[PDB]
Each structure stands twice: as structure tokens, then as C-alpha cells.
Design an enzyme around this catalytic site. Structure first.
Site, mmCIF file in Angstrom:
data_model
loop_
_atom_site.group_PDB
_atom_site.id
_atom_site.type_symbol
_atom_site.label_atom_id
_atom_site.label_comp_id
_atom_site.label_asym_id
_atom_site.label_seq_id
_atom_site.Cartn_x
_atom_site.Cartn_y
_atom_site.Cartn_z
ATOM 1 N N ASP B 8 0.725 -1.126 -0.320
ATOM 2 C CA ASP B 8 0.073 0.082 -0.021
ATOM 3 C C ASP B 8 0.873 1.301 -0.019
ATOM 4 O O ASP B 8 1.955 1.111 0.304
ATOM 5 C CB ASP B 8 -0.723 -0.014 1.346
ATOM 6 N N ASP B 10 0.171 5.004 0.965
ATOM 7 C CA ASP B 10 0.011 5.815 2.233
ATOM 8 C C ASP B 10 -0.005 5.098 3.494
ATOM 9 O O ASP B 10 -1.015 4.346 3.647
ATOM 10 C CB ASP B 10 -1.266 6.665 1.861
ATOM 11 N N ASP B 184 -2.377 -0.334 5.990
ATOM 12 C CA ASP B 184 -2.555 0.114 7.322
ATOM 13 C C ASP B 184 -3.865 0.129 7.597
ATOM 14 O O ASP B 184 -4.272 0.565 9.000
ATOM 15 C CB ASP B 184 -1.941 1.428 7.261
ATOM 16 N N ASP B 334 39.623 8.264 -13.706
ATOM 17 C CA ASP B 334 40.935 7.658 -14.428
ATOM 18 C C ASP B 334 41.091 8.657 -15.794
ATOM 19 O O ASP B 334 41.297 9.791 -15.331
ATOM 20 C CB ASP B 334 40.444 6.392 -15.165
ATOM 21 N N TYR B 465 46.476 6.453 -24.214
ATOM 22 C CA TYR B 465 47.725 6.543 -23.646
ATOM 23 C C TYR B 465 48.888 6.771 -24.796
ATOM 24 O O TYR B 465 49.971 6.807 -24.247
ATOM 25 C CB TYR B 465 47.902 5.104 -23.156
ATOM 26 N N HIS B 523 41.245 1.121 -7.174
ATOM 27 C CA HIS B 523 41.102 2.127 -8.358
ATOM 28 C C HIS B 523 39.667 2.181 -8.832
ATOM 29 O O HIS B 523 39.225 3.346 -9.175
ATOM 30 C CB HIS B 523 42.212 1.610 -9.484
HETATM 31 O O1 LIG Z 1 45.383 7.677 -17.644
HETATM 32 C C1 LIG Z 1 46.175 7.951 -16.561
HETATM 33 O O2 LIG Z 1 46.232 9.316 -16.075
HETATM 34 C C2 LIG Z 1 46.030 7.058 -15.415
HETATM 35 N N1 LIG Z 1 45.346 5.700 -15.564
HETATM 36 C C3 LIG Z 1 45.474 4.372 -14.936
HETATM 37 O O3 LIG Z 1 46.083 4.389 -13.825
HETATM 38 N N2 LIG Z 1 44.768 3.544 -15.465
HETATM 39 C C4 LIG Z 1 44.252 2.252 -15.075
HETATM 40 C C5 LIG Z 1 44.260 1.222 -16.014
HETATM 41 C C6 LIG Z 1 44.025 -0.363 -15.552
HETATM 42 C C7 LIG Z 1 45.244 -0.943 -14.641
HETATM 43 C C8 LIG Z 1 45.447 0.355 -13.469
HETATM 44 C C9 LIG Z 1 45.637 1.537 -14.222
HETATM 45 MG MG LIG Z 2 -3.569 3.061 3.508
#
Ligand SMILES: O=C(O)CNC(=O)NC1CCCCC1
Ligand SMILES: [Mg+2]
Ligand SMILES: O=C(O)CNC(=O)NC1CCCCC1
Ligand SMILES: [Mg+2]
Lengths: 547, 547
Positions: B8, B10, B184, B334, B465, B523
Site C-alpha cells: 500500500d 499511504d 495500514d 581515471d 595512452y 582504483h
Molecule cells: O591515464 C591516467 O592518467 C592513469 N590511468 C590509469 O592508472 N589507468 C588504470 C588502467 C587499469 C590498470 C590500472 C591503471
Molecule cells: Mg492506507
């Protein structure tokens, strides 16, 4: 020869020159003529302001640096400064004061619309002020209307430095001889001319344009007021929400603010709102132009029941549910309008406000059934011809291009008999095989609708007309209610099927109902009078929906 | 036996019973005990309130009808009513006062999580009050946590009327014997029991649960505090924005309010935010969980330059541009965190606020180059092994399932040596072929990431990267600036690659930088400590971003 128009921001596309404010601040505060400006241009190439202009330091970092200058410069001319003197306070005011110089922006658009590559070359800064959003929004608007936007604090070069002009030239992919550069600052014009570019000293807007009109051989001044901004499908953000196992609704989203959901009519698409989508967004809202179930990129189950008003409505509530929106402003046209009226009658909780164009709210008659009532109005005859599954589909799908060019027409253009349709056995029976192109739509615009309806055809859409009995029995459940939430009924004069006289009794069920009318406005409102619609809706949203 | 729990609203999932307020209003105003309640239940089956409960009339229509009752009922007991007496004023207050009875909702979820079909059976009304949004939002939340929601004013039946109970039974697709009904109100329990359903008179929450815990043989009370709500991909609203000819970014959108853009890290997805997405939305925001370029449904051009920080940033500004958003709160983790720091350094205008998890802002060193610096930190060794195109891709793509199960692990779970990776020639070289399932992720959650990376693989992500040198030269342009906009740096204790000590010098470039820390947090923050993160971010958003 000329193929590129480059505009300056402060003093050309934007006024009043955030700059100039300095001179006034002085006059205003009875300060030694130029005291403030000297502290501003202090250091020349190695000035705090030049740094701030090249993106080396933020505006927030600059302010304090520009204060000291107002003390040194005041120390030389044997002067002082009020106690409530604030460089911050001054600039925040100066900046938010600046607005888009409309006639200039329009002149720019025109040029672009006629083959010109446009671009904004400006000496701006990295605005990290609390009121920075001001600029952010102004640019958010100008940006789209120009191919390029070269900011000083972004490219690491400020204006007179020739480097930037080579950059401009190289960016435009054009040689000086075919470029027009407009600035309100003389110095910024020399480097331009030294390259051999057509330069125009922009003082008073109207004159600059005259020269521009001259140099470009295009009428920019005293030219007809354009149509609102139309949006390019491929530039829009597309959204998809699955409301049920086999049903996914597609919508176009633009802007931020109270959510305003646009529900088009038959046989249209989200594109039918192409003119109010930017406007409303720009107006401070989060526009969600829907692709109603059965159309465009939205699911189109074959089942007829799947398009009865109740089902359709629940799916809209679900659409909101999935999107995390508790309410939403529902604005509909044609069938969409019918949909939003029932949305306000069964889900007031979720409708922030309701608005309809052309479609009037008319409580269902408890006694007489729809089929019967509709038969009692020669104009609605077309709806009967929409009943037999397949029949209507076959004709409408036969030639999409012709179908849309025949439909989307001003009130004065017509070309489709509507009286005896069931009689004529067809909606186009005595219509041209190749209808002329309407004033409301360009060839492309029509082809957009075509490609859209090539997906699911007209079966889904037509089914909206195939649930009369059902919708009727449903509506009867609400015969005791009343629309007490903010509502707006926009009627169109020249709509001969959804005539304004049909909404004359609405205030009875919707007491505080507001209104809007449009002269010489056919059925296809959004397209016929886009400016009037945006004006009407924004006015209403601003007073009844933004609350 | 039991397989369905129906609650319910309320007095069960919502407290305090908007109803009860009546009794208090009387006591409060020293009114004849029941004066207000009698006027409320006036007319019985043919009462104004019963109508309003069956959806015949709106709450707004009811209020006046319920006022007269307060005069008639006051006329009988020989009484009066203060001058400032308002049924409207009373109910608006009563309703917004009502909140989700947390322990009850949780008990309901648990049941569902263990096979139970849940549903809310309530005698509600069509709320068209100006403050109707209150209810709207409360339901917007409860709705999702239950399979069904049977509203009285929607189904045309109120509670005791047996019809609705057959409706409930028929809706649940279950027989009385396997259903638990909690209310209730006693009267609402009889019809239930007469059908042979297990009924529980809910007085004090804790006891009701005890009985529920009893009847269902599941521990509902004193049970561990759950994890925030996770979102089902297929229920989410998906958005797509083309930022450049060949680049379209995908994002998940939920909620309304200041836009908060979530940018995940490598190798993740929008799904990495599955816990803060509902929370933040629910918190009053418009969450835009991104699928960073190179991941999920977003474009993944092969080109490495296409993933340098500058390009990536411009595309985010464009993402906003296309969406009609002038600003937006950028929260990243990250790589995403790295991205939002540069977003605040080059586009302050567009960043309403910036927030990073794990990733600290560290101005690039003008002298030493990245490659060199990274080589000077055994933990970053993995980044070098990410340089040679193809190499890393081959290992990571080899076994997606193993790849993600090996990566996504609590700080205490490990299983991936990180020191000598380039040395070992691989990231998994001495890792299990079939890693155990981490506490942070279920089998399904991992398979979601798998299917996602089956699209574009790890080339796009890895390229993030592969732009060190470039990103470095870019960052050097901002060495003179400072983050002056609202910023938040959330550090995680047990993150051994992005150690908290790395953010100790941030206040120098970000003076008003706020902070947050998390204990025993690996992490993978969003997944490791979801509750702490939502709490930390919402607190900050509410004080620095909602402004
Ligand atoms: O790009 C950055 O400034 C730092 N990046 C990371 O530390 N990436 C994780 C990837 C997976 C494993 C641990 C690190
Ligand atoms: Mg009720
Ligand atoms: O659904 C309704 O209530 C009314 N709909 C229309 O009038 N639709 C137009 C379709 C195209 C021809 C003109 C009528
Ligand atoms: Mg200028």
C-alpha cells in the site's frame, strides 16, 4: 571574387563593445579620460591584458592584475579611485550587457546562405567568472551560425599579430582577395588589408552593412525578416527510449531547462517542429521533439489497438519514467494535440503544462458514438476513408514525394479536395501527379519526410485514426474532470478541418485556458507561421511553465 | 508458496499517512475529534472522496467539495472553523510531508531480488495541484522498484471493493495463496483474506516487516544496507551526437536539472557509472553518462592522434554545443578525470564545475617530457607497455572475459602484477586463465563490458595512452592558468597506481579545491564504494554546482 566574410565579436556581432564600457565608466565616475583604458592596454605586447588575450591566464587571474594598473595609472595623472570601485563589478556588468547585434548576425547568415564561408575572428579570453555562463550562452548561439570561430585565447594569437591572419586565411582555405574582414578597431584592419583583404571599419552597424552589401553584391539591408532557425537532422542529438518490449520511441533533444515535449501530428515527424526546436531551446528550455509511435525512427507495431489513445498515453508516461523526468510540458499539434489533452486529463501529475495547436479539446459525447458524429461533418469524411486497413495505406504510400507535396501546403495553395473523399474513392483522385513545391517546404525538407516514411510507411500513423470507439470509451471516464493545469490553445484561422470555432467551448472544461490565434494559417502550423508559433509558445511557457 | 508482495502507498511505502494528518489537524486546532475525518469520508461509496479516488474528479475539484463537508460536519456537532482554515493548505503540507518509508521500500526490493513479484496497490487520486510535482517525483522513484503499480484513480476502482482485488490477482497472474498484501487500514485487509491472501496489518513498520520476514521466510530486517540502485542498460535512454563527420558519441541520460557529464576511464564505459547514475539523477540532476570516444557505442577511429587530449576535449565542447548545453558539470575517473581537468583549463566557460575521482591534476613539466617522467615510476611501467600499437591490443582482446575479471578487482583481491609488465612482456603473464569473480562485479556486469568491447576492441581506448608528447605540449600552454571554478578531488586510499599523495599539491593550481577521500577503495572507485561516491558527489554538487 569574394567568398568569405569574417566577423569580429565585440563591436560587430556583439554590442555594446564590452570594451567601450571603460570610456563610460570613466565619464560616469568623472575619471581622467582614458585612465581606465590606459590601465587596460598597459604593457602593450607584454601586457597583462595581452597575456589574458592569448589564453596564458584566466579572466579571473587578470582582474587583480588589471586593478593594480588602475592604481599605477591613477598614480601618474595625480588621481584616485572611489572606495566602491570594482574591475570585476564593472566587467560582469559590461559583458552581460553585451547582446547579439541582430541585424549583423542576420547579414552574416544571408551571406552564408548564398555560398559564403563565415567565421568569427575575435580577441577573447578564458572566462572563469561565476557569471561566465553569460558568454557561454551567447556563444552557444552564435557558434552554430558560422563555419569557424577563431578565438584569440584559444589559438595563442591575438589581433594585429599577422600570424593570426595567416591562420585565418589558412583556416578559411581562401586567399585575401576573396575575404571580407569586419572589425570596429582600425589597427585590426591594417594586417588584413596588407594581406590584400577587403576590410570594413564597423562603426555604426547599418553603414558597415551598406559597405558589405556593396562589396559582396548581395542585399543584406532592409531585407525581408528571415524564418526562425531550422535544424539539421544530422546535427541534432537523437534519443531512444524503449517503453515496452517491442516499442522504442525516438526523439530529438536540444537545450536545457524545463522539459518541453513536442508531439507532432499525422502524417508528420519530429521534423515538423524544426522551427520551434531551436527557438524554444534558445528560449531557456529542454526541447524533446518526439517521433510519435508509428513514425520515423520510432517503433511501428502493425496492431491497431497499439495506437489507441490510452496505450499511446501510458507509453508517454513511461517515456518520461525512463528519462527520469517527473513532469514535462506537453505541446501537440493535430493528433499530437489530441494526445496532450488526454495527457492532462489522465496524468496531470506528469504534465507541467499543456498546449495544443489547431486541435481543440472536446469532451466525448456519452450518447452518440464517434463514427456517427464524424459522419456528421463533411470535412471529417477523410477520417472514414482512413478506416479500412490497407486502402489508405496503398494510396499514401504509392508516391511518398507526391503524398507530402500534396499535403503540406499553405491554406491558399490547397490541391486536395477534402469533402467527398470516400466518394472519390481516394484522397488524391483529382490531384496532380507532380504537385508544385509549396512555399512552406523546400525540396529537401520534403525528401526528409519521404525517407522517414520509407521505414514504417503509413500503417502505424493511420492506425491513430483506427481507435475511435476505444478512445471514446476511455474519454468517457474523464467526463467528470477538468483541465486545471496551465493550458494554451493556439488556433489557426485558415485551417479548414480543425476550424477555430471548434474550440469556442473549451473554457468550460479548461477554466483558466489561455489562447493564441494566427492569421492566414493553414493546418500545418509549425511550417506555415513558424515565427508566430515560437513567439506564442515562448510567451506562454515563460509565464505559465517556467514558473 | 508465497510469490507476490503487494504494498500500500499511504502508510506502508509512504509515511506519514497523508491521511492521519487529519486527526492531527483536529487535535492541533482543538476540533471535535473526527470532525475533519467525517467530512472526508462523507458520502461513503457515493462520497465526493470516493469519486476523487476512482478518478472521476481531480484533487483540485475535490478540495472545494471537501470544504463544504467541513461546514456540514461542523454544523452538526455545533462547531465552527478558524478564518485561516484551508483544506488546500492542509493537504499540500500533509502530502509533501510524506516520504518514502525507506526500510519498507528496501524490504520490498529484497523480496523482489529473491524472486518475488512486487506491486503497489493504492487508493490515490489525480493530482493537478500546483505542487503536484511532489507526488510525481515520489512516484517517479518508487515506480521502478515494483513490477506493477495499481492506482485507484487509474483503474476506476478503490479499495475494499473486491473488484480491484480480483484485478490485483489477475494482474499479478497469481492466486491469493501466494500473495502477501500489506495495508495500514483494516478494512482493506478483509477482501484480501476473503480471497485467501496472506494479509499483514501494517502499524509500526518494524513489526509489519517482522511478520513479513516470517511469512516469506526471508530476512528483511536488520539486513545489510544494500548497494545503491544499479541501472538496467535496456531501460536507460540512449543518446547519440555526431561531433564530427566520422565521430558519434554515445551517452546514457537520466534525470532533469543541472547537466552532470560523467566521463569514465580506461578500459570502461558509461556502465562504470551504473551506481551514481540513478543516485545523482534522483539527487536533482540531469546525468549524462558518456561513452568516451573509442568505447562502447561511440565511434572508435583507428588514428592515434584522434585521441590526444586536445582533440578529445574539443569534441566534448562540441557534444555540448550540439545538445544545446552552455555549461555542464564534468566528473571524470581515471582518464576521464584527466579529461575533465583539461576541460576546466581550456573551457572554463563550458564547465559549470569539475570533479575527479582518483586522477589528480598535475601541471605538465615544461622541461622533462612525459615518456621520461613515466619511466621514473615503476607503477606507471604498464603505460609504456601500452605504447607499441597492437601489442597491448592483442593481449587485452585475447580474452575479454578474463581481461575484465582480471582488471575490475577490489584492492585486496588483486591478481595482476603491475611493477614489471614491460619486463614480463604482458599484463596477464602470470595471472589466472580463469580469474575468480570479484565482489565488485557480478557475472552479468562483466559480460556487459565484454559485449561492449567486442565492438571496437581496445585500440581506441589504448590510443588515449598514445598521445603523451602531444598532450604534454598542449598542457604547457596552460601552465600560467589556474582552476578557479568549483572543483572536487576525490581520492581513493587503496589505489596503488593513482595514489592520493599525488594530489597533495593540487591546491596550488586549484586554490578553492574541495576534497573527498575513501577508505579501502581500489582504483575502480565507482564499483568499489558506490555509496560513498554518491554521497561525496551529491554533497558537493548540492553546494557547488546547483548554486
Ligand atoms: O591515464 C591516467 O592518467 C592513469 N590511468 C590509469 O592508472 N589507468 C588504470 C588502467 C587499469 C590498470 C590500472 C591503471
Ligand atoms: Mg492506507
Ligand atoms: O486527429 C484529429 O483529431 C484531426 N486530424 C486532422 O485533421 N488531420 C489532418 C491530416 C491531413 C489532412 C487534413 C487533416
Ligand atoms: Mg573589436
Amino acid at each position: 571574387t569574394l567568398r568569405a566574410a569574417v566577423f569580429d565579436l565585440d563591436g560587430v556581432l556583439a554590442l555594446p563593445a564590452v570594451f567601450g564600457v571603460l570610456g563610460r565608466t570613466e565619464e560616469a565616475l568623472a575619471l581622467p579620460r582614458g585612465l581606465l583604458n590606459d590601465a587596460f592596454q598597459k604593457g602593450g605586447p607584454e601586457g597583462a591584458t595581452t597575456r589574458l588575450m592569448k589564453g596564458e591566464i584566466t579572466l579571473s587571474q587578470w582582474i587583480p592584475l588589471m586593478e593594480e594598473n588602475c592604481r599605477k595609472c591613477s598614480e601618474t595623472a595625480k588621481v584616485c579611485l572611489p572606495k566602491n570601485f570594482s574591475i570585476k563589478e564593472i566587467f560582469d556588468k559590461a559583458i552581460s550587457a553585451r547582446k547579439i547585434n541582430r541585424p549583423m548576425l542576420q547579414a552574416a547568415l544571408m551571406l552564408r546562405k548564398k555560398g559564403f564561408t563565415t567565421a568569427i575572428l575575435t580577441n577573447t579570453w578564458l572566462d572563469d567568472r561565476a557569471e561566465r555562463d553569460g558568454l557561454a550562452q551567447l556563444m552557444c548561439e552564435l557558434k552554430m551560425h558560422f563555419d569557424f570561430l577563431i578565438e584569440s585565447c584559444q589559438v595563442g594569437m591575438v589581433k594585429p599579430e599577422p600570424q593570426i591572419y595567416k591562420f585565418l586565411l589558412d583556416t578559411l582555405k581562401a586567399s585575401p582577395s576573396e575575404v571580407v574582414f569586419l572589425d570596429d578597431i582600425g589597427a585590426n584592419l591594417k594586417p588584413a588589408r596588407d594581406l590584400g583583404m577587403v576590410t570594413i571599419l564597423v562603426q555604426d552597424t547599418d553603414t558597415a552593412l551598406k559597405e558589405l552589401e556593396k562589396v559582396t553584391g548581395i542585399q543584406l539591408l532592409n531585407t525581408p525578416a528571415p524564418l526562425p532557425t531550422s535544424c539539421n537532422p544530422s546535427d541534432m542529438s537523437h534519443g531512444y527510449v524503449t517503453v515496452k518490449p517491442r516499442v522504442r520511441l525516438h526523439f530529438v533533444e536540444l537545450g536545457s531547462g524545463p522539459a518541453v515535449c513536442l508531439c507532432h501530428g499525422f502524417p508528420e515527424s519530429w521534423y515538423s517542429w524544426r522551427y520551434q526546436i531551436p527557438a524554444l531551446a534558445q528560449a531557456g528550455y529542454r526541447v524533446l521533439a518526439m517521433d510519435m509511435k508509428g513514425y520515423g525512427e520510432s517503433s511501428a507495431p502493425p496492431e491497431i489497438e497499439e495506437y489507441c489513445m490510452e496505450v499511446l498515453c501510458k507509453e508517454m508516461v513511461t517515456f518520461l519514467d525512463k528519462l527520469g523526468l517527473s513532469q514535462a510540458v506537453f505541446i501537440g499539434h493535430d493528433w499530437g494535440g489530441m494526445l496532450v489533452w488526454y495527457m492532462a486529463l489522465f496524468y496531470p501529475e506528469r504534465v507541467r503544462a499543456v498546449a495544443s495547436l489547431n486541435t481543440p479539446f472536446i469532451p466525448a459525447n456519452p450518447n452518440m458514438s464517434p463514427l456517427e458524429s464524424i459522419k456528421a461533418n463533411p470535412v471529417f469524411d477523410y477520417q472514414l476513408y482512413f478506416q479500412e486497413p490497407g486502402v489508405a495505406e496503398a494510396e499514401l504510400e504509392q508516391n511518398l514525394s507526391r503524398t507530402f507535396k500534396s499535403l503540406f501546403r499553405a491554406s491558399d495553395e490547397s490541391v486536395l479536395s477534402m469533402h467527398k473523399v470516400c466518394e472519390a474513392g481516394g484522397l488524391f483522385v483529382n490531384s496532380p501527379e507532380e504537385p508544385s513545391l509549396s512555399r512552406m517546404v523546400t525540396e529537401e525538407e520534403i525528401q526528409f519526410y519521404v525517407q522517414q516514411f520509407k521505414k514504417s510507411g503509413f500503417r502505424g500513423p493511420l492506425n491513430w485514426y483506427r481507435n475511435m470507439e476505444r478512445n471514446w470509451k476511455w474519454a468517457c471516464k474523464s467526463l467528470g474532470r477538468k483541465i486545471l493545469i496551465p493550458a494554451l490553445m493556439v488556433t489557426a484561422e485558415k485551417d479548414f478541418v480543425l476550424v477555430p470555432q471548434m474550440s469556442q467551448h473549451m473554457e468550460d472544461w479548461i477554466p483558466h485556458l489561455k489562447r493564441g490565434h494566427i492569421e492566414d494559417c493553414g493546418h500545418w502550423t509549425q511550417m506555415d507561421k513558424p515565427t508566430e508559433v515560437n513567439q506564442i509558445l515562448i510567451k506562454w511557457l515563460d509565464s505559465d511553465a517556467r514558473n
